[PDB]
Amino acid sequence: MPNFFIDRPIFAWVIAIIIMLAGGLAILKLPVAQYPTIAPPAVTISASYPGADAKTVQDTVTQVIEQNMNGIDNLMYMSSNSDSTGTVQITLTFESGTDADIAQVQVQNKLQLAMPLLPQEVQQQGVSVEKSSSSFLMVVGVINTDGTMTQEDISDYVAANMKDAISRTSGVGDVQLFGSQYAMRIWMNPNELNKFQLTPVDVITAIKAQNAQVAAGQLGGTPPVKGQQLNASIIAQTRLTSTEEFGKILLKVNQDGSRVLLRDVAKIELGGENYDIIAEFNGQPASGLGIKLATGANALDTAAAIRAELAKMEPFFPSGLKIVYPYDTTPFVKISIHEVVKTLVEAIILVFLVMYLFLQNFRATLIPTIAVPVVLLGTFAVLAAFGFSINTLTMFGMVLAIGLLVDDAIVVVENVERVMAEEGLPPKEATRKSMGQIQGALVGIAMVLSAVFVPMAFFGGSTGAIYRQFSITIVSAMALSVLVALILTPALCATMLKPIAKGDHGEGKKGFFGWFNRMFEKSTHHYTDSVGGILRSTGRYLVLYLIIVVGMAYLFVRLPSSFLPDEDQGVFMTMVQLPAGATQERTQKVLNEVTHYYLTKEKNNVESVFAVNGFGFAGRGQNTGIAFVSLKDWADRPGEENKVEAITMRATRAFSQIKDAMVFAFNLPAIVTATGFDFELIDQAGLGHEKLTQARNQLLAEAAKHPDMLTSVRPNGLEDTPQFKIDIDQEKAQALGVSINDINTTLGAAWGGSYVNDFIDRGRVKKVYVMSEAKYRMLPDDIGDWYVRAADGQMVPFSAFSSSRWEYGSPRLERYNGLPSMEILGQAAPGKSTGEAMELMEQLASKLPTGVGYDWTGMSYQENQAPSLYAISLIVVFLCLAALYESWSIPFSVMLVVPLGVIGALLAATFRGLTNDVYFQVGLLTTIGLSAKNAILIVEFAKDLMDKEGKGLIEATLDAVRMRLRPILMTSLAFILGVMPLVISTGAGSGAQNAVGTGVMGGMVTATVLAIFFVPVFFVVVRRRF
Amino acid sequence: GAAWGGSYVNDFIDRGRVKKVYVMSEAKYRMLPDDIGDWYVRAADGQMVP
Amino acid sequence: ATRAFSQIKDAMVFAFNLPAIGFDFELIDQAGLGHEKLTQARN
Amino acid sequence: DLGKKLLEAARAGQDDEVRILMANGADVNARDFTGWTPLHLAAHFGHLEIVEVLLKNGADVNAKDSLGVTPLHLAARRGHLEIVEVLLKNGADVNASDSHGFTPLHLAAKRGHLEIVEVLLKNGADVNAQDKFGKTAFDISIDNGNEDLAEILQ
């Protein structure tokens, strides 16, 4: 209560100090990240099957695992795919609010109990289970400019000298290695093996025997014979450590004395665990580390921590080994945080100027300078308590709140001044009277703004996570603003304000201020003259109002929607797709041709090109690839002609000439997620893969007959490719004394590669792979070079007990919720909503062959509440004003100001060509909130005059509108100026600033220019009808 | 490994409860470094060798 | 129902309304008695 | 190349695109690393309209694989009887042998397809012929366990 702290200024100071301290403490022990966790918890089960095709992996691994994912809590849906690179990946997504830790341990446990049902080699390799919903803080590239070490060389070094150190660094939660440590490699030679009557079976047997850890006992171990003096351990054979030792492995001792070593039938060397992917950084061999942020950790304090650790392990790097930073989200956070402090600072300076321009005294201009910072620090404490963090969302959440904070400060101060000038009341008793005029109004406003913002924090799923940040942030600042405006501010007025004589409006005074006062004091007459005339012709303005409303609805539905504005993140990607059967070498040429384009025709804007040959977000293999382009700073790429979208389109148009493959550039998502749908075509019977493909093509062709509804409807997978089937004749095999096991191992190991056992390299355990030399496993004509020893001891060629044929199979098999499936992506045609393009796709799918179902996944799910929430919101707002005014009717004269603020925002957004995103929507709610605040005060004053001094309707409205002119004008002037920097901001996170800027400035101008004229009208017409 | 270290072979039921079955050399033959040559293994032709 | 099933020979047939929503005694073999001797203790 | 867009259409079963490519003279003898032609694909994946349109356009009926396989071989193995007859009318070698010695009959008898085996027989297909193993149409039927196919090929 104001009257309590007017007599007790010191008490109010205590509260201000406590809030400041609590806030200061919070702004030091509060997490810092770019974005909060918005995506639903998701766990990914990864597994590997060396040499296995897409079909084998699915029918022995994927399917076995999927059948055991039962009993887990809060599953929304399961998804998986099985590539021809021997890899499988099962992603389980969970309900929002699900403890990711509990979800993962439940997934992990069910997987464990299913481990005994998997193939041996799949168990050897191991099965991973990790949280996949996480995002990278940065990726640390490690290249070799010296050209003295391969990517396998870099990888091993990073894993044995860097990975651990980085993991232990403060702030980092997880670390992914973009490569693989060394691994003993035995490249067999079929020509030599046959010469000594040997097979890959022998080579494996010998390695498992002459490379193992054999357990022995002790000397004088318990129970001992009494009298034993020493107790030592016995050491037996132990795993090999060098390449030389492996080559010395004995395979066969001929009957002539000589022996045959593993070195004699195979080249022995250290290589990588796999050779599927080859990475390059500006044409130079490279590796890297994908770093994730630990929960509750500070992104800035972590990025600095890893750079220190890297610099601390720098003097140990081999020659020509330098580290690069292709990807890094740290700069975004620094820029974001800096631009927030900047905005908050120049907001206080502007309020200082406008406060001195109108009031013309320092003591008064000092009050808002204290009230505002107090509230800010305070809300940081409130955020901390709720468990939030400093992030891009909550940051902008405050730069939109400063308008409501500055307002509450200006209203209390100005009202006290206006009172003393209209009557010879000293500050103390003038503050009491002044507060007595706005006490109830300020409380009611707090209720209304709560009713406006709190329901927004009830949207479900990912979208709800984003709104929840803004809402809670703004509501906290709002509630904490009113609280200060009832304790600290009233005390600061009755203490720091100097007396002002009655009638003293500075009308006669020297110079500018004297002129300004006469100017403004005469403009308040011209203004009340206009309102007076307006109230003589209300009908004419009721019509203009409807025109505004109608225009609002029109300008609203004609505004395109996107979830979050697109940004220039200083990086973008370019996909590369070669035809079926395309080799890794060919793919490389295209990637070189792509990298050469960036480091030449775009040298001014491109810093580096991370070419990853063999990877893709929707398919992997030798015929695929990605190029992660990293740009120079935003201060080196001036103009829209040098931004991501301009460079991207210019790059895609340039790669069209390449007749070798499909190559296109594209900016990445704002948050790692897009628009369009995520359609899932499901084989709900036993139809098979070919029958499912037909149902897909059939639906894709049908969707092609609706370019006015569906656009870019494409499969999100790989196309079937020719496979080389080998038919082993069981009869002729048993007729030659050849074991099927011998056959399927010499073939499986030589051509597919087999992981045999482990060895120690410089104190680290590493894998041992056996596999044919490249030149002996390339073409179908090589299969005849491989021999298999029979029982009689003779070597039998593969071309003796087998046949072959070309076939078609899938390189990537997909599944959804345990059933076969194919993912389909698309978007709604220009002008149409997603809710319409989805409804159509359901209709097209209903006409598909019997036994084919469908479902929505991802964004398209967690897809509906807006009107329901703002119907409850609209009601609560009404009930609040109803209690504030003790009237069922009056509330209407306030709720009618809504469109006035909206129309302006729509004008600005449409004019500049922006979208109806979350920043825009929140910008609306604050504009609506502020303009509403104005109406509440204007109505409160007018109504009061009628109830107290029994003034006429028009008399009261004109007097009320006059008293509120300056306050409204000031807060609006200081607001618009403080937002300008955001509207014109270019580059560096501007996409967000421009949204919160144009939407607010445009809406703020229209919400004050029209409100000061329209709200007096609303009050009158409402007071006349009811 | 079986003689000097002891090898766990399987389980057996002792008075109702499942317990282990161990195979290890008698203390007397696993005390000295020279006792390593007292142990014989069978060859492919059925001949023993230290 | 249970009254009519008591007529059935060599079978325990009970129809019960699930409780919404007697004693449970447990005989324990503390020593290594064995199953047969435990049965004797039950009988 | 239009030849590639033809291989995609011939496999996909898009008659409309295929005819269009015909207008535009997309190579009818186009190949991929397996040696399969648009006629190979169409026969294998069974679309007739394509097969006919392709044959009308000068396509090699006896186009061979890198492994020696032909369109009759493909159509016989898979199930398409209609395709088999059309191919035979256009001069498909009924006795074409694989690199492994397999003929259109073997692939037919291997998978059953009694209705397709009869057609191949009334066109002069050997009974006699041996695959790499030395099995014959009868040897394949007996081992497979098809009593009905045993009578036909006897």
mmCIF file of N, CA, C and O in Angstrom, chain A residues 672-713:
data_model
loop_
_atom_site.group_PDB
_atom_site.id
_atom_site.type_symbol
_atom_site.label_atom_id
_atom_site.label_comp_id
_atom_site.label_asym_id
_atom_site.label_seq_id
_atom_site.Cartn_x
_atom_site.Cartn_y
_atom_site.Cartn_z
ATOM 1 N N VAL A 672 17.273 -25.995 -34.226
ATOM 2 C CA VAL A 672 17.270 -27.294 -34.826
ATOM 3 C C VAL A 672 16.170 -28.175 -34.243
ATOM 4 O O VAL A 672 16.418 -29.193 -33.590
ATOM 5 N N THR A 673 11.109 -26.859 -36.435
ATOM 6 C CA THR A 673 12.311 -27.190 -37.192
ATOM 7 C C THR A 673 12.096 -26.983 -38.687
ATOM 8 O O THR A 673 12.988 -27.242 -39.495
ATOM 9 N N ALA A 674 10.906 -26.515 -39.049
ATOM 10 C CA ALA A 674 10.571 -26.272 -40.448
ATOM 11 C C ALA A 674 9.069 -26.095 -40.634
ATOM 12 O O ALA A 674 8.341 -25.837 -39.675
ATOM 13 N N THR A 675 8.610 -26.235 -41.874
ATOM 14 C CA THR A 675 7.199 -26.092 -42.187
ATOM 15 C C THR A 675 6.874 -27.179 -43.204
ATOM 16 O O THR A 675 7.783 -27.777 -43.766
ATOM 17 N N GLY A 676 5.599 -27.458 -43.435
ATOM 18 C CA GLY A 676 5.257 -28.529 -44.341
ATOM 19 C C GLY A 676 4.753 -29.601 -43.433
ATOM 20 O O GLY A 676 4.426 -29.307 -42.321
ATOM 21 N N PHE A 677 4.644 -30.824 -43.895
ATOM 22 C CA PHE A 677 4.170 -31.872 -43.033
ATOM 23 C C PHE A 677 5.169 -32.989 -42.845
ATOM 24 O O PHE A 677 6.201 -32.962 -43.461
ATOM 25 N N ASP A 678 4.870 -33.959 -41.981
ATOM 26 C CA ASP A 678 5.727 -35.089 -41.868
ATOM 27 C C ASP A 678 4.778 -36.236 -41.998
ATOM 28 O O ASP A 678 4.243 -36.718 -41.054
ATOM 29 N N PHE A 679 4.534 -36.620 -43.223
ATOM 30 C CA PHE A 679 3.621 -37.714 -43.514
ATOM 31 C C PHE A 679 4.335 -39.056 -43.453
ATOM 32 O O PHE A 679 5.483 -39.179 -43.876
ATOM 33 N N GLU A 680 3.649 -40.060 -42.922
ATOM 34 C CA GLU A 680 4.223 -41.392 -42.805
ATOM 35 C C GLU A 680 3.308 -42.431 -43.450
ATOM 36 O O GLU A 680 2.184 -42.648 -43.000
ATOM 37 N N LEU A 681 3.796 -43.065 -44.511
ATOM 38 C CA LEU A 681 3.031 -44.085 -45.216
ATOM 39 C C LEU A 681 3.349 -45.456 -44.627
ATOM 40 O O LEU A 681 4.495 -45.899 -44.662
ATOM 41 N N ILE A 682 2.350 -46.149 -44.113
ATOM 42 C CA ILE A 682 2.567 -47.366 -43.371
ATOM 43 C C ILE A 682 1.979 -48.651 -43.935
ATOM 44 O O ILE A 682 0.815 -48.731 -44.211
ATOM 45 N N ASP A 683 2.792 -49.686 -44.013
ATOM 46 C CA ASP A 683 2.350 -50.959 -44.497
ATOM 47 C C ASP A 683 1.692 -51.669 -43.344
ATOM 48 O O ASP A 683 2.321 -52.219 -42.500
ATOM 49 N N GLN A 684 0.379 -51.644 -43.343
ATOM 50 C CA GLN A 684 -0.411 -52.075 -42.224
ATOM 51 C C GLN A 684 -0.840 -53.514 -42.291
ATOM 52 O O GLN A 684 -1.490 -54.001 -41.408
ATOM 53 N N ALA A 685 -0.508 -54.160 -43.380
ATOM 54 C CA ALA A 685 -0.640 -55.577 -43.554
ATOM 55 C C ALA A 685 0.722 -56.133 -43.813
ATOM 56 O O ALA A 685 1.684 -55.744 -43.199
ATOM 57 N N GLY A 686 0.800 -57.071 -44.722
ATOM 58 C CA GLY A 686 2.043 -57.737 -44.995
ATOM 59 C C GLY A 686 2.470 -57.485 -46.393
ATOM 60 O O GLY A 686 3.024 -58.351 -47.010
ATOM 61 N N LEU A 687 2.168 -56.310 -46.902
ATOM 62 C CA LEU A 687 2.261 -56.027 -48.304
ATOM 63 C C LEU A 687 3.630 -56.156 -48.860
ATOM 64 O O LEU A 687 3.810 -56.593 -49.942
ATOM 65 N N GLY A 688 4.607 -55.733 -48.119
ATOM 66 C CA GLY A 688 5.980 -55.831 -48.570
ATOM 67 C C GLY A 688 6.548 -54.475 -48.927
ATOM 68 O O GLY A 688 5.903 -53.450 -48.717
ATOM 69 N N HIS A 689 7.760 -54.472 -49.472
ATOM 70 C CA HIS A 689 8.443 -53.224 -49.782
ATOM 71 C C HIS A 689 8.069 -52.675 -51.158
ATOM 72 O O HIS A 689 7.908 -51.467 -51.327
ATOM 73 N N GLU A 690 7.932 -53.561 -52.137
ATOM 74 C CA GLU A 690 7.584 -53.137 -53.489
ATOM 75 C C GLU A 690 6.149 -52.624 -53.564
ATOM 76 O O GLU A 690 5.881 -51.600 -54.192
ATOM 77 N N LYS A 691 5.228 -53.336 -52.921
ATOM 78 C CA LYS A 691 3.830 -52.916 -52.895
ATOM 79 C C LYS A 691 3.673 -51.579 -52.178
ATOM 80 O O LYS A 691 2.782 -50.792 -52.500
ATOM 81 N N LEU A 692 4.544 -51.327 -51.206
ATOM 82 C CA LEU A 692 4.505 -50.082 -50.447
ATOM 83 C C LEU A 692 5.031 -48.934 -51.303
ATOM 84 O O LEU A 692 4.506 -47.822 -51.262
ATOM 85 N N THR A 693 6.076 -49.213 -52.076
ATOM 86 C CA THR A 693 6.662 -48.216 -52.963
ATOM 87 C C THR A 693 5.650 -47.753 -54.005
ATOM 88 O O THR A 693 5.602 -46.575 -54.356
ATOM 89 N N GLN A 694 4.845 -48.688 -54.496
ATOM 90 C CA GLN A 694 3.819 -48.370 -55.479
ATOM 91 C C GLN A 694 2.755 -47.454 -54.881
ATOM 92 O O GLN A 694 2.338 -46.485 -55.510
ATOM 93 N N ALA A 695 2.324 -47.762 -53.662
ATOM 94 C CA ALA A 695 1.338 -46.937 -52.976
ATOM 95 C C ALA A 695 1.872 -45.524 -52.766
ATOM 96 O O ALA A 695 1.115 -44.554 -52.799
ATOM 97 N N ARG A 696 3.180 -45.414 -52.550
ATOM 98 C CA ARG A 696 3.815 -44.113 -52.383
ATOM 99 C C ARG A 696 3.784 -43.337 -53.692
ATOM 100 O O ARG A 696 3.232 -42.241 -53.761
ATOM 101 N N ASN A 697 4.384 -43.916 -54.727
ATOM 102 C CA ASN A 697 4.409 -43.302 -56.048
ATOM 103 C C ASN A 697 3.017 -42.872 -56.496
ATOM 104 O O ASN A 697 2.837 -41.790 -57.058
ATOM 105 N N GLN A 698 2.038 -43.730 -56.235
ATOM 106 C CA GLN A 698 0.649 -43.452 -56.575
ATOM 107 C C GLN A 698 0.145 -42.196 -55.874
ATOM 108 O O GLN A 698 -0.565 -41.384 -56.467
ATOM 109 N N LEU A 699 0.517 -42.039 -54.607
ATOM 110 C CA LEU A 699 0.104 -40.873 -53.836
ATOM 111 C C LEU A 699 0.905 -39.632 -54.220
ATOM 112 O O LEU A 699 0.388 -38.517 -54.181
ATOM 113 N N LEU A 700 2.167 -39.828 -54.590
ATOM 114 C CA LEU A 700 3.014 -38.719 -55.017
ATOM 115 C C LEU A 700 2.536 -38.149 -56.348
ATOM 116 O O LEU A 700 2.616 -36.943 -56.583
ATOM 117 N N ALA A 701 2.043 -39.026 -57.215
ATOM 118 C CA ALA A 701 1.515 -38.611 -58.509
ATOM 119 C C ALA A 701 0.188 -37.885 -58.338
ATOM 120 O O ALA A 701 -0.123 -36.950 -59.077
ATOM 121 N N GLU A 702 -0.593 -38.319 -57.354
ATOM 122 C CA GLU A 702 -1.887 -37.715 -57.082
ATOM 123 C C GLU A 702 -1.710 -36.313 -56.508
ATOM 124 O O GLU A 702 -2.450 -35.391 -56.852
ATOM 125 N N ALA A 703 -0.719 -36.161 -55.635
ATOM 126 C CA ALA A 703 -0.419 -34.871 -55.024
ATOM 127 C C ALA A 703 0.179 -33.908 -56.043
ATOM 128 O O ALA A 703 0.239 -32.699 -55.811
ATOM 129 N N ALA A 704 0.628 -34.451 -57.168
ATOM 130 C CA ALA A 704 1.183 -33.640 -58.244
ATOM 131 C C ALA A 704 0.062 -33.025 -59.070
ATOM 132 O O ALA A 704 0.296 -32.151 -59.906
ATOM 133 N N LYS A 705 -1.158 -33.492 -58.828
ATOM 134 C CA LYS A 705 -2.330 -32.985 -59.528
ATOM 135 C C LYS A 705 -3.026 -31.909 -58.703
ATOM 136 O O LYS A 705 -4.197 -31.605 -58.922
ATOM 137 N N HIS A 706 -2.295 -31.338 -57.750
ATOM 138 C CA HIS A 706 -2.829 -30.273 -56.909
ATOM 139 C C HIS A 706 -1.767 -29.229 -56.580
ATOM 140 O O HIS A 706 -1.445 -29.016 -55.413
ATOM 141 N N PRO A 707 -1.218 -28.570 -57.613
ATOM 142 C CA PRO A 707 -0.189 -27.543 -57.414
ATOM 143 C C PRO A 707 -0.745 -26.299 -56.720
ATOM 144 O O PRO A 707 0.010 -25.377 -56.417
ATOM 145 N N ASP A 708 -2.053 -26.281 -56.477
ATOM 146 C CA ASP A 708 -2.706 -25.140 -55.841
ATOM 147 C C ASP A 708 -2.957 -25.411 -54.368
ATOM 148 O O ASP A 708 -3.474 -24.561 -53.640
ATOM 149 N N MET A 709 -2.586 -26.610 -53.937
ATOM 150 C CA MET A 709 -2.850 -27.048 -52.577
ATOM 151 C C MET A 709 -1.582 -27.651 -51.994
ATOM 152 O O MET A 709 -1.172 -27.308 -50.888
ATOM 153 N N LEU A 710 -0.962 -28.548 -52.756
ATOM 154 C CA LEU A 710 0.263 -29.220 -52.334
ATOM 155 C C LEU A 710 1.468 -28.824 -53.186
ATOM 156 O O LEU A 710 1.420 -28.878 -54.414
ATOM 157 N N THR A 711 2.553 -28.437 -52.524
ATOM 158 C CA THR A 711 3.784 -28.087 -53.222
ATOM 159 C C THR A 711 4.988 -28.773 -52.585
ATOM 160 O O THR A 711 5.065 -28.910 -51.365
ATOM 161 N N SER A 712 5.918 -29.217 -53.423
ATOM 162 C CA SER A 712 7.141 -29.864 -52.957
ATOM 163 C C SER A 712 6.877 -31.130 -52.144
ATOM 164 O O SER A 712 7.549 -31.379 -51.142
ATOM 165 N N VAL A 713 5.903 -31.925 -52.574
ATOM 166 C CA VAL A 713 5.639 -33.213 -51.936
ATOM 167 C C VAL A 713 6.628 -34.262 -52.432
ATOM 168 O O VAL A 713 6.534 -34.735 -53.566
#
